[PDB]
Amino acid sequence: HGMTLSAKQQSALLLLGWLQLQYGHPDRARILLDALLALHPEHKEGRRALVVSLLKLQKGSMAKEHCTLLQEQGEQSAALWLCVSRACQQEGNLEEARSAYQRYLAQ
């Protein structure tokens, strides 16, 4: 009851989006992952997959902002900065990409 997903339903939707991303359909993954984040915006696993889906869609500016939200949620994975660097390279921010890539190698 209610516009919400159980823990297993959230994982199922995350898996549906991850499969689309795996098979080179980032536009379809983004659709499923946006819905998961509309109902459960705190879903970190869903947001990381959306970040990569946006990178595959050449949407670097959006992908970098989603990484910023992960960072302030407490995300401490080193591969987060690899996404930030890749996102900055897509937008021409080569100096910001180098700064983020240094943090990826630091951790």
Place this chain on the structure above:
Amino acid sequence: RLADRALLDFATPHHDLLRPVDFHQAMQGLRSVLAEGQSPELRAAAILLEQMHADEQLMQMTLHLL
């Protein structure tokens, strides 16, 4: 193209749906919720997973192989 593997690994979640009985219950419960959403993001996703029903075999196979 070299970094594509590390990006996919970052997007891969670190299991609750291993049992096939639990998988079908999760899919039916997921389709019932998104079909009641009114926002364009929920409606677009409700259309998409209704077209992925023939892919449910590929879904469960990927779960067990991880």
